[PDB]
Design a protein around this ligand. Sequence first.
Ligand SMILES: O=C1C[C@@H](c2ccc(C[C@H](NS(=O)(=O)c3cccc(C(F)(F)F)c3)c3nc(Cc4ccccc4)c[nH]3)cc2)S(=O)(=O)N1
Ligand SMILES: [Mg+2]
Length: 298
Amino acid sequence: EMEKEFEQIDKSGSWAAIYQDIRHEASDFPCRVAKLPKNKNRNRYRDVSPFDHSRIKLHQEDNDYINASLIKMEEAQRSYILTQGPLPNTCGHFWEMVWEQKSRGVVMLNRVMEKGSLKCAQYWPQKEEKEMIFEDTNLKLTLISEDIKSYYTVRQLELENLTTQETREILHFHYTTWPDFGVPESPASFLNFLFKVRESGSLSPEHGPVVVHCSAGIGRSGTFCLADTCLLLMDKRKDPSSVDIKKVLLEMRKFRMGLIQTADQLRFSYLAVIEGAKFIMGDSSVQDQWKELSHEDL
Ligand SMILES: O=C1C[C@@H](c2ccc(C[C@H](NS(=O)(=O)c3cccc(C(F)(F)F)c3)c3nc(Cc4ccccc4)c[nH]3)cc2)S(=O)(=O)N1
Ligand SMILES: [Mg+2]
């Protein structure tokens, strides 16, 4: 039924109309804290703000603001923190959030520079011997190792609370070829990556919410979370054909504005879920097929 709906949307050529209807029906909640004058330099984009009700609060008394939102999907039983690409002055805040929320994984879907423009600060160390210290938050971050694939890289980071000396291993899943306002090369390349994150254990409820970000934390980040959530629901319900992706996206938009930024990212989300359903329904060949198709060992 999901592919029947997909098939009729394609035949009618109504992706833009469907997507615009979602934009029109999406929740509108205040973002008063994000808009306070003192928080202007903590926001990368003036039109992308976290709603007050779902924003992540830093545990510091000075200013607890960070442009990050808790997306809590009740039925799917999974939470995600979606945030913008950190700014030069909010990298300490970013890691303080990771620490305080007890996240185990960070999913990055953009590159630091895209088409001649900075989209995110270099918030993690590129070299083992050049660790980073965020003085304002008292955290130390070290690159332990990295596994570089053709379109994505997985890194092992060690985050240390300098005050208590406790250290934690943080896994960084960096998708390096997802164009801004665009889509992955194929459902296979997207799913291969998603399942790598799932298999790492990072999404387990024993850990805090995975932190997902792109440049604004809504387009690419929204696509990633929508597909994951829909696949979770299909695996959970007695009838996987009951999953209404448009309803799931409207639910996600109650927690952060603008998730899914183009009609084609919405269409791609359908393809990813339709393709991923094969695995949910049993198929044990699709995963290797996805890896092969993704050409990750290029
Ligand atoms: O696939 C994506 C889209 C990126 C993205 C999404 C939103 C923004 C916020 C920008 N604010 S602004 O300070 O660059 C900006 C730009 C224009 C107007 C504007 C106001 F509405 F006037 F505030 C703000 C931004 N770019 C547009 C382009 C766009 C146009 C039509 C439909 C969809 C997107 C709209 N807002 C930046 C990156 S992502 O990193 O979330 N992944
Ligand atoms: Mg070296």
